[PDB]
Protein backbone atom coordinates (compact mmCIF):
# COMPACT_ATOMS: atom_id res chain seq x y z
CA UNK A 1 0.00 0.00 0.00
CA UNK A 2 0.95 3.58 0.94
CA UNK A 3 4.02 5.03 2.69
CA UNK A 4 4.17 6.84 6.03
CA UNK A 5 6.91 9.38 6.96
CA UNK A 6 9.54 7.43 5.03
CA UNK A 7 9.63 9.12 1.64
CA UNK A 8 24.49 -20.09 6.81
CA UNK A 9 22.21 -17.22 5.68
CA UNK A 10 20.07 -14.52 7.28
CA UNK A 11 18.29 -12.69 4.44
CA UNK A 12 16.61 -15.90 3.24
CA UNK A 13 13.75 -15.53 5.74
CA UNK A 14 12.24 -12.30 4.34
CA UNK A 15 10.24 -11.84 1.15
CA UNK A 16 11.50 -9.70 -1.75
CA UNK A 17 8.39 -8.75 -3.72
CA UNK A 18 8.21 -6.74 -6.92
CA UNK A 19 5.90 -3.74 -7.03
CA UNK A 20 4.92 -0.84 -9.26
CA UNK A 21 4.12 2.66 -8.00
CA UNK A 22 0.61 3.63 -9.04
CA UNK A 23 0.54 6.92 -10.93
CA UNK A 24 -2.51 8.63 -9.42
CA UNK A 25 -2.95 6.80 -6.10
CA UNK A 26 0.69 7.00 -5.04
CA UNK A 27 0.25 3.59 -3.38
CA UNK A 28 2.24 0.46 -4.20
CA UNK A 29 0.91 -2.49 -6.20
CA UNK A 30 2.67 -5.84 -5.83
CA UNK A 31 3.17 -7.51 -9.21
CA UNK A 32 4.72 -10.77 -10.35
CA UNK A 33 6.86 -9.22 -13.10
CA UNK A 34 7.94 -5.85 -14.51
CA UNK A 35 8.20 -3.99 -11.21
CA UNK A 36 10.23 -0.87 -10.41
CA UNK A 37 10.33 -1.23 -6.60
CA UNK A 38 11.23 -3.97 -4.13
CA UNK A 39 8.99 -4.48 -1.10
CA UNK A 40 10.18 -6.35 2.00
CA UNK A 41 7.36 -7.19 4.45
CA UNK A 42 7.74 -8.48 7.99
CA UNK A 43 9.56 -11.79 8.49
CA UNK A 44 7.92 -14.47 10.62
CA UNK A 45 11.34 -15.70 11.81
CA UNK A 46 13.30 -12.52 12.65
CA UNK A 47 11.57 -9.44 14.10
CA UNK A 48 11.27 -5.86 12.88
CA UNK A 49 13.31 -6.37 9.70
CA UNK A 50 11.55 -3.60 7.68
CA UNK A 51 12.00 -1.00 10.42
CA UNK A 52 15.59 -2.20 10.89
CA UNK A 53 16.46 -1.88 7.20
CA UNK A 54 14.71 1.50 6.99
CA UNK A 55 16.66 3.24 9.74
CA UNK A 56 19.95 1.57 8.77
CA UNK A 57 19.50 2.83 5.20
CA UNK A 58 19.01 6.37 6.46
CA UNK A 59 22.11 6.09 8.66
CA UNK A 60 24.12 5.19 5.55
CA UNK A 61 22.82 8.30 3.78
CA UNK A 62 23.96 10.46 6.71
CA UNK A 63 27.60 9.32 6.45
CA UNK A 64 27.66 10.05 2.71
CA UNK A 65 26.94 6.67 1.11
CA UNK A 66 24.94 6.53 -2.12
CA UNK A 67 21.49 5.32 -1.01
CA UNK A 68 18.45 5.06 -3.33
CA UNK A 69 14.90 6.10 -2.48
CA UNK A 70 13.68 3.90 0.38
CA UNK A 71 11.09 4.00 3.13
CA UNK A 72 8.23 2.23 4.88
CA UNK A 73 4.61 1.47 3.95
CA UNK A 74 1.63 0.03 5.82
CA UNK A 75 0.75 -3.54 4.86
CA UNK A 76 -2.78 -4.93 4.80
CA UNK A 77 -2.34 -6.46 8.27
CA UNK A 78 -1.35 -2.98 9.55
CA UNK A 79 2.33 -3.92 9.87
CA UNK A 80 5.24 -1.94 8.46
CA UNK A 81 6.83 -2.90 5.14
CA UNK A 82 10.10 -1.56 3.73
CA UNK A 83 10.36 -0.41 0.12
CA UNK A 84 13.31 0.53 -2.09
CA UNK A 85 13.45 1.96 -5.60
CA UNK A 86 15.40 -0.31 -7.94
CA UNK A 87 18.42 1.36 -9.53
CA UNK A 88 18.41 -1.17 -12.40
CA UNK A 89 15.17 0.44 -13.65
CA UNK A 90 15.35 4.06 -14.75
CA UNK A 91 12.07 5.23 -16.27
CA UNK A 92 10.81 4.86 -19.85
CA UNK A 93 11.05 1.12 -19.09
CA UNK A 94 14.83 1.07 -19.54
CA UNK A 95 17.28 -1.12 -17.64
CA UNK A 96 20.84 -0.80 -16.34
CA UNK A 97 23.44 -3.56 -16.20
CA UNK A 98 23.72 -4.90 -12.64
CA UNK A 99 25.99 -7.76 -11.60
CA UNK A 100 26.71 -8.97 -8.08
CA UNK A 101 30.15 -10.07 -6.91
CA UNK A 102 29.31 -13.79 -6.87
CA UNK A 103 28.54 -13.63 -10.59
CA UNK A 104 31.71 -11.55 -11.14
CA UNK A 105 33.95 -13.98 -9.21
CA UNK A 106 32.51 -17.32 -10.33
CA UNK A 107 30.53 -18.12 -7.16
CA UNK A 108 26.87 -19.02 -6.62
CA UNK A 109 24.19 -18.91 -3.93
CA UNK A 110 25.63 -21.90 -2.07
CA UNK A 111 29.18 -20.46 -1.94
CA UNK A 112 28.35 -16.76 -1.60
CA UNK A 113 30.12 -16.80 1.80
CA UNK A 114 33.26 -18.61 0.56
CA UNK A 115 35.27 -15.52 -0.32
CA UNK A 116 37.08 -12.67 1.44
CA UNK A 117 37.24 -8.88 1.58
CA UNK A 118 40.53 -9.15 -0.31
CA UNK A 119 38.75 -10.86 -3.21
CA UNK A 120 36.12 -8.09 -3.09
CA UNK A 121 38.94 -5.60 -3.68
CA UNK A 122 40.25 -7.67 -6.60
CA UNK A 123 36.88 -7.52 -8.37
CA UNK A 124 36.72 -3.74 -7.97
CA UNK A 125 40.24 -3.32 -9.36
CA UNK A 126 39.42 -5.49 -12.38
CA UNK A 127 36.09 -4.03 -13.52
CA UNK A 128 35.47 -0.57 -12.05
CA UNK A 129 36.20 2.58 -14.05
CA UNK A 130 37.75 4.54 -11.16
CA UNK A 131 39.02 1.84 -8.76
CA UNK A 132 40.72 4.43 -6.53
CA UNK A 133 37.40 6.24 -6.00
CA UNK A 134 35.58 2.96 -5.34
CA UNK A 135 38.08 1.93 -2.66
CA UNK A 136 37.23 5.09 -0.73
CA UNK A 137 33.59 4.13 -0.33
CA UNK A 138 34.35 0.42 0.09
CA UNK A 139 36.33 1.59 3.12
CA UNK A 140 33.34 3.67 4.19
CA UNK A 141 30.86 0.89 3.42
CA UNK A 142 32.87 -1.73 5.32
CA UNK A 143 33.35 0.58 8.31
CA UNK A 144 29.64 1.44 8.28
CA UNK A 145 28.57 -2.22 8.18
CA UNK A 146 30.89 -3.03 11.09
CA UNK A 147 29.49 -0.13 13.14
CA UNK A 148 25.81 -0.96 12.54
CA UNK A 149 26.32 -4.69 12.99
CA UNK A 150 25.67 -5.73 9.39
CA UNK A 151 27.19 -9.22 9.45
CA UNK A 152 25.45 -10.47 6.28
CA UNK A 153 27.54 -8.70 3.61
CA UNK A 154 28.15 -11.76 1.42
CA UNK A 155 29.10 -11.75 -2.26
CA UNK A 156 25.53 -11.19 -3.50
CA UNK A 157 25.29 -7.97 -1.45
CA UNK A 158 28.09 -6.29 -3.44
CA UNK A 159 27.12 -5.26 -6.97
CA UNK A 160 28.63 -3.35 -9.89
CA UNK A 161 26.37 -1.06 -11.92
CA UNK A 162 26.97 0.27 -15.44
CA UNK A 163 25.54 3.79 -15.65
CA UNK A 164 26.46 6.11 -18.54
CA UNK A 165 29.28 3.73 -19.56
CA UNK A 166 30.84 4.17 -16.11
CA UNK A 167 31.27 1.02 -14.01
CA UNK A 168 31.20 1.56 -10.25
CA UNK A 169 29.86 0.02 -7.05
CA UNK A 170 26.06 0.09 -7.05
CA UNK A 171 24.08 2.16 -4.54
CA UNK A 172 23.49 0.63 -1.12
CA UNK A 173 21.09 -2.30 -0.82
CA UNK A 174 20.27 -4.94 1.81
CA UNK A 175 21.84 -2.90 4.63
CA UNK A 176 20.49 -3.62 8.11
CA UNK A 177 21.60 -4.41 11.66
CA UNK A 178 21.45 -8.18 11.31
CA UNK A 179 23.25 -8.76 14.63
CA UNK A 180 20.36 -7.50 16.76
CA UNK A 181 17.88 -9.33 14.50
CA UNK A 182 19.17 -12.80 15.48
CA UNK A 183 20.27 -14.49 18.67
CA UNK A 184 23.66 -16.19 19.03
CA UNK A 185 25.16 -14.11 16.23
CA UNK A 186 28.29 -15.94 15.12
CA UNK A 187 30.24 -13.35 13.10
CA UNK A 188 30.90 -9.62 12.86
CA UNK A 189 31.79 -9.77 9.15
CA UNK A 190 30.30 -12.05 6.51
CA UNK A 191 33.50 -12.21 4.45
CA UNK A 192 36.82 -12.52 6.31
CA UNK A 193 39.19 -9.56 6.50
CA UNK A 194 42.84 -10.48 7.16
CA UNK A 195 41.50 -13.99 7.78
CA UNK A 196 39.24 -12.65 10.54
CA UNK A 197 35.46 -12.73 10.81
CA UNK A 198 35.27 -11.97 14.56
CA UNK A 199 37.12 -9.80 17.06
CA UNK A 200 38.26 -7.37 14.37
CA UNK A 201 40.27 -4.45 15.69
CA UNK A 202 41.20 -0.88 14.78
CA UNK A 203 44.49 -1.93 13.16
CA UNK A 204 42.62 -4.42 10.96
CA UNK A 205 40.43 -1.70 9.41
CA UNK A 206 42.66 1.39 9.51
CA UNK A 207 46.07 -0.17 8.78
CA UNK A 208 45.88 -3.54 7.00
CA UNK A 209 42.64 -2.77 5.15
CA UNK A 210 42.90 0.97 4.51
CA UNK A 211 46.65 1.26 3.89
CA UNK A 212 47.96 -2.12 2.75
CA UNK A 213 44.99 -3.40 0.71
CA UNK A 214 43.21 -0.22 -0.45
CA UNK A 215 46.19 2.13 -0.81
CA UNK A 216 44.56 5.17 0.79
CA UNK A 217 46.85 7.79 2.28
CA UNK A 218 46.75 8.73 5.95
CA UNK A 219 45.00 12.07 5.42
CA UNK A 220 42.19 10.36 3.49
CA UNK A 221 41.69 7.78 6.25
CA UNK A 222 41.77 10.47 8.93
CA UNK A 223 39.10 12.48 7.12
CA UNK A 224 36.78 9.48 6.82
CA UNK A 225 37.34 8.39 10.42
CA UNK A 226 36.60 11.97 11.47
CA UNK A 227 33.42 11.81 9.36
CA UNK A 228 32.21 8.85 11.43
CA UNK A 229 33.06 10.72 14.65
CA UNK A 230 30.75 13.67 13.95
CA UNK A 231 27.89 11.40 12.84
CA UNK A 232 27.53 9.48 16.14
CA UNK A 233 25.30 12.18 17.72
CA UNK A 234 22.98 12.30 14.70
CA UNK A 235 23.01 8.49 14.44
CA UNK A 236 21.73 8.13 18.01
CA UNK A 237 19.10 10.81 17.36
CA UNK A 238 17.80 9.12 14.20
CA UNK A 239 17.60 5.71 15.89
CA UNK A 240 15.58 7.09 18.80
CA UNK A 241 13.13 8.60 16.32
CA UNK A 242 12.95 5.48 14.12
CA UNK A 243 10.03 3.06 13.91
CA UNK A 244 11.94 0.37 15.83
CA UNK A 245 10.48 -0.73 19.14
CA UNK A 246 12.09 0.63 22.28
CA UNK A 247 13.63 -2.78 22.98
CA UNK A 248 15.02 -2.97 19.43
CA UNK A 249 16.26 0.62 19.71
CA UNK A 250 18.22 -0.16 22.89
CA UNK A 251 19.83 -3.19 21.23
CA UNK A 252 20.76 -0.99 18.26
CA UNK A 253 22.37 1.75 20.35
CA UNK A 254 24.19 -0.67 22.66
CA UNK A 255 25.73 -2.48 19.69
CA UNK A 256 26.60 0.81 17.99
CA UNK A 257 28.32 1.99 21.18
CA UNK A 258 30.22 -1.31 21.52
CA UNK A 259 31.61 -1.15 17.98
CA UNK A 260 32.49 2.53 18.37
CA UNK A 261 34.40 1.78 21.58
CA UNK A 262 36.34 -0.97 19.79
CA UNK A 263 37.50 1.56 17.17
CA UNK A 264 38.45 4.09 19.91
CA UNK A 265 35.74 6.57 18.89
CA UNK A 266 35.21 7.83 22.46
CA UNK A 267 38.84 8.15 23.63
Amino acid sequence: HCPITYEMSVQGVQKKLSAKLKIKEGCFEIVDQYGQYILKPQSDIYPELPENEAITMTLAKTIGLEVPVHGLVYSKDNSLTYFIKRFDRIGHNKKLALEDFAQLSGEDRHTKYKSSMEKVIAVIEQFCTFPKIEFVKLFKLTLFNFLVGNEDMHLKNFSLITKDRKISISPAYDLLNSTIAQKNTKEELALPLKGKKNNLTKSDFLKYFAIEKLGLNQNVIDGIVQEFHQVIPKWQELIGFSFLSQEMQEKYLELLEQRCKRLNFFD
Binding site: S9, Q11, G12, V13, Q14, K15, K16, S18, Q33, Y34, G35, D88, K94, K95, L96, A97, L98, E99, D100, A102, Q103, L104, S105, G106, E107, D108, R109, F127, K156, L160, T162, I167
Partner: protein, 102 residues
Amino acid sequence: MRKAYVSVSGIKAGILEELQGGTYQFTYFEDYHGAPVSLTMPLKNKVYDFDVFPPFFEGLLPEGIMLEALLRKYKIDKNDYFGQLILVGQDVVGAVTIEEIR
Protein backbone atom coordinates in the same frame (compact mmCIF):
# COMPACT_ATOMS: atom_id res chain seq x y z
CA MET B 1 18.18 -30.34 -26.02
CA ARG B 2 17.20 -27.13 -24.21
CA LYS B 3 18.33 -23.79 -25.66
CA ALA B 4 17.38 -20.21 -24.84
CA TYR B 5 17.77 -16.76 -26.34
CA VAL B 6 19.77 -14.28 -24.25
CA SER B 7 18.83 -10.64 -24.83
CA VAL B 8 20.41 -7.47 -23.44
CA SER B 9 18.06 -4.48 -23.05
CA GLY B 10 15.67 -6.11 -25.52
CA ILE B 11 18.31 -6.71 -28.21
CA LYS B 12 19.12 -10.38 -28.77
CA ALA B 13 22.73 -10.97 -27.71
CA GLY B 14 23.34 -14.70 -27.93
CA ILE B 15 22.24 -18.24 -27.19
CA LEU B 16 22.71 -20.20 -23.95
CA GLU B 17 22.86 -23.92 -24.74
CA GLU B 18 22.41 -26.84 -22.39
CA LEU B 19 25.05 -29.30 -23.62
CA GLN B 20 25.52 -33.05 -23.34
CA GLY B 21 26.45 -34.47 -19.96
CA GLY B 22 26.29 -31.46 -17.67
CA THR B 23 28.13 -28.76 -19.59
CA TYR B 24 26.75 -25.45 -20.85
CA GLN B 25 27.81 -23.09 -23.63
CA PHE B 26 26.99 -19.47 -24.45
CA THR B 27 27.56 -18.16 -27.98
CA TYR B 28 27.38 -14.50 -28.94
CA PHE B 29 25.52 -13.59 -32.11
CA GLU B 30 27.93 -12.15 -34.68
CA ASP B 31 25.44 -9.34 -35.32
CA TYR B 32 25.37 -8.34 -31.65
CA HIS B 33 27.70 -5.49 -30.77
CA GLY B 34 26.36 -3.55 -27.76
CA ALA B 35 27.21 -4.22 -24.10
CA PRO B 36 28.37 -7.62 -22.79
CA VAL B 37 25.88 -9.99 -21.19
CA SER B 38 28.27 -10.15 -18.23
CA LEU B 39 31.50 -8.36 -17.38
CA THR B 40 33.05 -11.84 -17.23
CA MET B 41 32.06 -12.27 -20.90
CA PRO B 42 33.61 -9.54 -23.06
CA LEU B 43 32.61 -9.31 -26.70
CA LYS B 44 36.20 -10.09 -27.75
CA ASN B 45 35.28 -13.77 -27.27
CA LYS B 46 32.13 -15.13 -28.90
CA VAL B 47 32.04 -18.58 -27.26
CA TYR B 48 32.12 -19.46 -23.55
CA ASP B 49 32.11 -23.01 -22.16
CA PHE B 50 31.18 -24.15 -18.65
CA ASP B 51 31.46 -27.43 -16.77
CA VAL B 52 28.51 -26.43 -14.54
CA PHE B 53 25.71 -23.90 -14.81
CA PRO B 54 27.47 -20.59 -15.51
CA PRO B 55 27.71 -18.36 -12.44
CA PHE B 56 26.23 -15.27 -14.09
CA PHE B 57 23.01 -17.05 -15.08
CA GLU B 58 22.87 -18.78 -11.69
CA GLY B 59 23.06 -15.34 -10.05
CA LEU B 60 19.73 -14.37 -11.62
CA LEU B 61 17.73 -17.07 -9.80
CA PRO B 62 15.63 -16.37 -6.69
CA GLU B 63 17.04 -16.98 -3.23
CA GLY B 64 15.80 -17.99 0.20
CA ILE B 65 12.08 -17.54 0.71
CA MET B 66 11.53 -16.31 -2.86
CA LEU B 67 13.00 -19.55 -4.18
CA GLU B 68 10.50 -21.55 -2.12
CA ALA B 69 7.75 -19.31 -3.53
CA LEU B 70 8.87 -20.27 -7.03
CA LEU B 71 9.12 -24.00 -6.35
CA ARG B 72 5.52 -24.07 -5.09
CA LYS B 73 4.21 -22.05 -8.06
CA TYR B 74 5.82 -24.09 -10.87
CA LYS B 75 6.14 -27.83 -11.48
CA ILE B 76 9.94 -27.79 -11.64
CA ASP B 77 12.70 -29.59 -9.77
CA LYS B 78 14.65 -27.76 -7.07
CA ASN B 79 17.98 -28.42 -8.81
CA ASP B 80 16.95 -27.61 -12.41
CA TYR B 81 18.68 -24.24 -12.60
CA PHE B 82 18.24 -23.90 -16.37
CA GLY B 83 14.54 -24.71 -16.16
CA GLN B 84 14.00 -22.21 -13.34
CA LEU B 85 15.91 -19.57 -15.33
CA ILE B 86 13.50 -19.92 -18.27
CA LEU B 87 10.55 -19.41 -15.92
CA VAL B 88 11.88 -16.06 -14.63
CA GLY B 89 13.83 -15.02 -17.74
CA GLN B 90 11.22 -12.42 -18.68
CA ASP B 91 12.36 -10.21 -15.76
CA VAL B 92 15.54 -10.55 -13.67
CA VAL B 93 17.87 -8.13 -11.90
CA GLY B 94 20.19 -7.27 -14.79
CA ALA B 95 19.43 -5.79 -18.20
CA VAL B 96 19.51 -9.40 -19.46
CA THR B 97 16.43 -11.45 -20.38
CA ILE B 98 16.17 -15.14 -21.36
CA GLU B 99 13.47 -16.72 -23.54
CA GLU B 100 13.37 -20.41 -24.43
CA ILE B 101 13.84 -21.39 -28.06
CA ARG B 102 11.78 -24.62 -28.10
